[PDB]
Every structure is written in structure tokens, then in C-alpha cells.
């Protein structure tokens with residue numbers, strides 16, 4: 001449905017020039033602000049350049065100012081990154097990005113309901129967040145050794161729970177495969193229901209409503225602060241422990257698309273630029 005694919009990456013000599021393009025599908029580039037990011041080898045993703053919805057404002061990161069220029073062709077539904085005077089430090093995977101909404105209310109809800117609790121998440125969700133959640137014991141499930149010694153890495157559901165210790169509540173924070181496993185064990189669901197019709201590749205497991213009793217619920221219209229209407233909800237299991245799940249669900253239980261939340265943004269595949 002919605003898809004971005006970059007091209008133009010190449011091996012290029014220092015001082016040379018390159019032009020990246022990002023072909024968009026499923027939406028018009030001139031309706032949203034488009035952004036370029038890049039991730040140098042074994043480094044964290046950084047923002048490179050962006051262009052506003054109307055095409056009037058172009059912003060650049062310090063290290064590329066005067067060398068890169070972003071532009072777009074409304075007809076070809078494509079964004080471009082002209083890169084000149086390439087430096088070896090420009091070496092990275094370059095990623096196209098579209099900003100289709102924001103929902104800070106859900107992130108405030110998430111923070112408020114997880115601070116001072118341990119959080120369990122799968123490896124893909126760790127990658128989607130990209131950073132430890134401060135003020136929380138982070139527990140990541142993965143069959144493979146960890147890659148970040150700031151968080152606790154575990155190899156099984158039972159170890160994840162044991163890693164939490166004796167706490168009154170454990171928060172399972174995603175993603176789809178992890179939710180499936182912890183749903184049968186959960187006493188409580190914190191849900192954000194988002195009024196967004198999006199396809200994704202990750203879903204919240206179907207929970208049966210008669211299994212669950214709503215103890216809190218609160219609908220908020222969309223406005224200039226949250227671009228989709230949303231409804232917070234807290235459910236308790238009829239006939240239950242300390243395990244809670246917290247998740248934000250768009251229509252039909254979609255929770256994710258390529259390690260991002262599709263009510264807010266979509267990412268491209270990335271194109272490799274090597275300056276050497």
C-alpha cells in the first residue's frame with residue numbers, strides 16, 4: 001500500500017558527486033514533509049535533510065550544509081538528494097522517510113504507564129526504538145547474543161519474567177511476536193485505539209472481548225496536537241498475576257510496518273553510499 005524505495009547509492013571517490021532518489025508509492029510527496037536520514041556503519045541513524053509539506057522550507061544538518069540539496073518532483077512522486085563534494089564521513093546507508101502524522105499523546109501515555117516498571121520487548125522492537133528506555137529495566141528477548149550492554153538480554157519467556165524480579169507489575173511493550181506469547185499470561189491490557197486506516201506487517205493478537213473487562217476508557221478527537229483521534233483503554237482479565245501488555249492499535253489491530261508506526265511515518269529500504 002505505502003512504500004518508499006531509494007536508489008542512486010554507489011561507490012564514489014572523495015570530492016565526487018551523487019544524486020539519490022526516493023520513489024514513493026501510495027501517497028503524494030507534495031502533501032507531506034519528506035526527510036532524508038543516514039546511518040553510517042555501526043553508528044546510530046542521524047537526520048540529514050528535510051523538506052516541508054508545501055515545498056517552501058528546506059532544512060539541513062550542520063555537517064552537510066552547503067553540500068547537499070533536497071528537492072522533489074511532484075509529477076514523478078520522487079524526492080531527490082543531490083550530494084556534492086562527498087567526504088568519507090558521508091559514507092552511510094541513506095534512508096528516505098515520510099512524516100504522515102504525530103501522536104505524542106500515545107507516547108506520554110506509554111511513558112506514564114511504564115516509568116519505574118520493568119519492560120519486556122522483542123528484538124525487533126528494541127531495533128524500532130533504537131535506544132534504552134531510561135528509568136526502566138529494559139529486558140530484550142532474543143535467541144542470539146545481545147548487542148548493547150545497557151539493557152538485559154534474555155533467551156526465553158521464563159527468563160524475561162525472572163529478570164523482572166519481585167515487582168508488582170511487568171510491562172510487555174511489544175512487538176507482535178512477543179505480544180502473542182504474553183497475552184495468555186496477562187492480567188491487564190493498556191491499549192491505545194487509533195482511528196487510522198493503515199496496512200502493516202505486524203498485528204496485535206486477536207483478544208476475545210468477553211475475556212476482558214474495561215476499567216478505563218477515554219476518547220480524544222484529532223486536533224493540531226494529535227493528527228488522529230485516539231482512545232485510551234485499560235482492560236482486566238475476567239478470571240486471572242503481574243503481567244500487563246501495553247500497545248497502540250490502529251484499525252484491525254495493526255501495530256507496525258517495517259519497524260515503525262504507520263500512523264506517524266514510513267521508511268524506505270535504504271541505499272548504500274560509499275565514499276572511498
Ligand SMILES: NC(=O)C1=CN([C@@H]2O[C@H](COP(=O)(O)OP(=O)(O)OC[C@H]3O[C@@H](n4cnc5c(N)ncnc54)[C@H](OP(=O)(O)O)[C@@H]3O)[C@@H](O)[C@H]2O)C=CC1
Pocket residue numbers: 121122123124125126128141142143144154155156157173174175176177178179181202246247248249254255256257258259260261
Ligand atoms: N504500536 C505499538 O504499540 C507497537 C508497535 N511495534 C511494532 O511491532 C513491530 C515488531 O514486532 P515483531 O516484528 O513481532 O518483533 P518483536 O518485537 O516481537 O521481537 C521479535 C523478536 O524477539 C525475539 N523473541 C521473541 N520471542 C522470543 C523467545 N520466546 N525467545 C527468544 N527470543 C524471542 C526474537 O528475536 P531473535 O530473532 O534475535 O531471536 C524475535 O525475532 C515493529 O514494527 C514495531 O514498530 C512495537 C512495539 C509496540
Ligand SMILES: COc1cc(Cc2cnc(N)nc2N)cc(OC)c1OC
Pocket residue numbers: 106107109110128129172173174191192246247248259260261
Ligand atoms: C517510546 O517510543 C516508542 C515506544 C513504543 C512502544 C509502545 C508505544 N506506545 C504504546 N501505546 N505502547 C507501546 N508498547 C514503540 C515505538 O516504536 C514502535 C516507540 O518509538 C516511536
